[PDB]
Amino acid sequence: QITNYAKEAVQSAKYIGQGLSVTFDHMRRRPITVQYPYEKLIPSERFRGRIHFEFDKCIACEVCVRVCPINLPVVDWVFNKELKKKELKHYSIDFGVCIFCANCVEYCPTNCLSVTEEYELATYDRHELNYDSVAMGRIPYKVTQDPMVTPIREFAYLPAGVMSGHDLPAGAQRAGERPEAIAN
């Protein structure tokens, strides 16, 4: 009646008041966001960006092909029966077909293939992703050595205690390789 609609409404007229001051207190916090072209995020030590190649190390034995998920890396090789060894002449991994699973870099004894860190490889034509053996053998792009990036670190690379990579003036990873070599 006239004695209910000003008391059956305060049950939710004050729930928004304890919902407004909660959401309004999210604006006081620092905006956790990683602006890409100006603050690139440093990848991990095991991140699999794209493949690096050394031309004078792969003696044409195609274990890069036999453990590939889709038999991708194109090994163009002759038998070369004059010098009693097989030597290749081309090595092309079609990116775009290339998932970055890195089975070639695991099953190799001679340590030829290797993963870089770059990922910003986004062209205008798919046939420009057929990286040649001298086009995979170029230098990586390191996100620290660029005079526009302010390269912030990742989680599990901050020091122990902090869960943000923005306002970090110094520090390192939260463990040491050899503290316990001269101690124990």
Partner 1 sequence: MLLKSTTRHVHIYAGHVVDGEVHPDTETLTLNVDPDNELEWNEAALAKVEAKFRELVANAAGEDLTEYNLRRIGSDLEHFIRSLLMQGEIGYNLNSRVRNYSLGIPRVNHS
Partner 2 sequence: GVYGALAGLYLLVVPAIVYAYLNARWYVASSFERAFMYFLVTFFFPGLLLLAPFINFRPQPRSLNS
Partner 3 sequence: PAILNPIARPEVPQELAENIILTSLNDVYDWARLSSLWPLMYGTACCFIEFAAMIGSRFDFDRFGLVPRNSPRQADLIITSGTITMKMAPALVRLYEQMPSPKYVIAMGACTITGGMFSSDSYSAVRGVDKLIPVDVYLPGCPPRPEAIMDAIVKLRKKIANEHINERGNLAQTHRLFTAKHKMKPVPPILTGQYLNAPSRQAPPPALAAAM
Task: Note the residues at the interface with ligand SF4 (CB under 6 A).
Answer: 51, 58, 61-64, 68-69, 72-73, 93, 98-104, 108, 110, 112-113
CB closer to partner 3, 55 vs 119: 119
Q: Say how many C-beta atoms besides its own lie within 10 A of residue 164's C-beta.
A: 12
Burial class (CB in 10 A: 0-12, 13-18, 19+), 166: middle
Residue 61 assigned ligand-binding role: yes
**Residue 58 is assigned to a ligand binding site:** yes
Residue 21 binds to partner 2 (criterion: CB under 8 A):
no
**Which residues, in sequence order, are CB contacts of 32 under 8 Å at separation 6+?**
164, 166
Q: d(Cα 50, Cα 52) in Å, to the nearest integer?
A: 7
| Of 96, 132, 99, the residue nearest 115 (C-alpha) | 99
Q: Helices H, strands E: what count in the chain?
A: 3, 5
The answer to whether 82 touches 153, Cβ cutoff 8 Å, is: no
Least spacing, CB of residue 76 vs ligand SF4, in Å = 12
Binding of partner 1 by 180 (CB under 8 A): no
**From the CB of 126, what's the least distance to partner 1, in Å?**
6
Residue 70 binds partner 3 (CB under 8 A): yes
Q: How many chain residues touch partner 1 (CB under 8 A)?
A: 4
112 is in an annotated binding site: no
Q: Is residue 100 a contact residue for partner 3 (CB under 8 A)?
A: yes
Contact between 125 and partner 3 per CB under 8 A = yes
Binding residues among 105-124 for partner 1 as defined by CB under 8 A:
124
In the numeric block, which tokens belong to residue 12?
Answer: 């939710």
Cβ neighbour number for residue 93 with a 10 Å cutoff:
23
104 annotated as a binding-site residue: yes
Mark the binding-site residues for [4Fe-4S] cluster, compressed into ranges. 58, 61, 64, 68, 98, 101, 104, 108
Residues that bind partner 3 (CB under 8 A): 32-37, 40-41, 69-71, 94-101, 119-126, 129
